[PDB]
DNA sequence: ACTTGTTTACATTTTG
DNA sequence: CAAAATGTAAACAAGT
């Protein structure tokens, strides 16, 4: 098991991201590629990821431009919590 | 059928 | 000795 908190994995997925933002499935793919450990039991840890993403205010939800209206929004970091490293 | 998102509830962990 | 951070499970609502 990798030694990172779920909040750290989301943060790390968003920073390595191009646009410094990520859809949900972007976070998932980053975590699943980077660590094959999270290839097993996706349902449980992806619930923990949604729980952390919703509950932690350091993460901010960014919709599409104007009316993009896609399946989810993007996710980004807060310009105050990004000082905290992983 | 599912994905996404919010929230509650409870268990575990980690140091003043 | 709670407390705060964190993990896990789960019920539930809104959405081409």
Numbering used by the authors: 181 to 266
Could you share sentences copied from the article?
FOXL2-DBD bound to the DBE2 DNA with 1:1 stoichiometry in the asymmetric unit, which was similar to previous structures of other FOX proteins and the DBE2 DNA complex with root mean square deviations (RMSDs) for all Cα atoms of ∼0.33–0.51 Å. Similar to the FOXL2:p53-DNA complex, the α3 helix in FOXL2 directly contacts the consensus motif (5′-GTAAACA-3′) in the major groove of DBE2 DNA. Asn100 formed a bidentate interaction with the base of A10 (3.1 and 3.4 Å, respectively), while His104 was mainly inserted into the major groove in DNA and formed hydrogen bonds with T8 and T9. In addition, Ser107 bound to the phosphate backbone of T6′ (2.6–2.7 Å) (top). Notably, the side chain of Lys124 was deeply inserted and bound to the base of T3′ toward the minor groove of DBE2 DNA (bottom). Cys134 formed a disulfide bond with Cys111, connecting wings 1 and 2, thereby decreasing the flexibility of wing 2 and bringing wing 2 near the minor groove of DNA, suggesting that disruption of the disulfide bond would be related to adult-type granulosa cell tumors. FOXL2-DBD bound to the DBE2 DNA with an apparent KD of 0.79 ± 0.1 μM and with 1:1 stoichiometry, which is consistent with its crystal structure.
Here, we found that FOX family proteins bind to the non-canonical homotypic cluster of the p53 promoter region (TP53). Analysis of crystal structures of FOX proteins (FOXL2 and FOXA1) bound to the p53 homotypic cluster indicated that they interact with a 2:1 stoichiometry accommodated by FOX-induced DNA allostery.
